[PDB]
């Protein structure tokens, strides 16, 4: 299993998820089971919480390439959460058995990928951007913002999710964003 | 443009918010506010017909000096999906362990 596109729309409407099982024949049998969405408030160390934010069973649809690749366009207002002040955990469970002779570790039935709205963090960093121009001084705000972002980045990439939640709460939980207007802005 | 409008409204609203909280704003920044809204009315009026693309380049590159100059004016954020180093998501699929006269091959 792997992630193709895991992102929040820059208009702060849609939590975009696009999962697809690996194309290698080892994993031909394995199929996607469900999509579970958790936030920093409903996160548990192992597996999804027993009180998630959204559940989506793949098998309640056409049942095989359609089953191997799934995509969602969840609107965030139906989830009753803030697009910018929330950090989502996307769990994908697979149903099946990978054929033998696959190297171990590749046969991980569960995969986890997080999500954050980077636009408000860029909005904060732009305030200190011009410190880079001014020589004779350390751009301390720019450095602080970069390190704040990379703390979350590294803690995510190493699997140290609890400290990642702690840093997100310390830094970015008070982020603000322009709530998208329900009347669709018409253009094309 | 429709964005010089937003920047000007934000800037002057912040100006009057400061004059509400405090009773003083640097006139070195009132100069920047004056330049900003003067440019926006210049570009949203009957004088937008005298501008070439070189003039557009110069105007934008001169307005970006006002971007982070004061708190009233901010760096605008556009919808961008690019970066200086992009990701390579292409996949490798050779044909029955074959090669060309010099190199490998795929589907």
């Amino acid at each position: 299993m792997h992630f193709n596109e895991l992102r929040i729309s820059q208009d702060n409407r849609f939590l975009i998820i696009d999962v697809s099982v690996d194309n290698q024949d080892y994993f031909e049998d394995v199929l996607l089971d469900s999509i579970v969405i958790d936030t920093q408030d409903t996160f548990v160390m192992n597996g999804p919480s027993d009180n998630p934010l959204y559940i989506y069973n793949v098998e309640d649809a056409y049942d095989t390439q359609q089953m191997k690749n799934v995509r969602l366009e969840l609107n965030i207002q139906d989830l009753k959460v803030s697009p910018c002040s929330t950090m989502f955990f996307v769990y994908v469970k697979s149903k099946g058995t990978p054929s033998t002779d696959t190297p171990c570790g590749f046969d991980k039935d569960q995969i986890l990928g997080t999500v954050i709205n980077l636009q408000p963090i860029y909005k904060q960093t732009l305030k200190y951007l011009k410190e880079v121009e001014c020589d004779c001084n350390i751009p301390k705000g720019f450095i602080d913002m970069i390190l704040k972002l990379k703390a979350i980045e590294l803690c995510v990439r190493t699997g140290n999710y609890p400290q990642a939640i702690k840093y997100w709460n310390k830094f970015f939980i008070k982020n603000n964003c322009k709530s998208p207007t329900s009347n669709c802005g018409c253009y094309g | 443009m429709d964005k010089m409008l937003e920047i000007s409204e934000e800037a002057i609203t912040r100006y009057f918010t400061t004059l509400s909280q405090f009773g003083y704003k640097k006139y070195s920044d009132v100069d920047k506010i004056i330049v900003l809204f003067f440019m926006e009315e210049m570009l949203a009026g009957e004088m937008s017909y005298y501008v070439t693309q070189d003039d557009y380049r110069n105007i934008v590159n001169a307005l970006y000096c006002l971007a982070g100059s004061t708190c009233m004016i901010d760096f605008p954020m556009f919808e961008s999906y690019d970066t200086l180093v992009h990701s390579n998501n292409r996949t490798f699929v050779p044909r029955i362990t074959e090669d060309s006269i010099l190199r490998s091959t795929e589907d």
Binding site: N23 | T91, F92, V93, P94, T97
Partner: peptide, 19 residues
């Protein structure tokens, strides 16, 4: 690195999988 032969065989095996 030396890449003894079974490593090359592993690389062949993986690459030839989605071949």
């Amino acid at each position: 690195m030396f890449f003894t032969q079974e490593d090359y065989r592993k690389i062949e095996k993986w690459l030839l999988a989605n071949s």
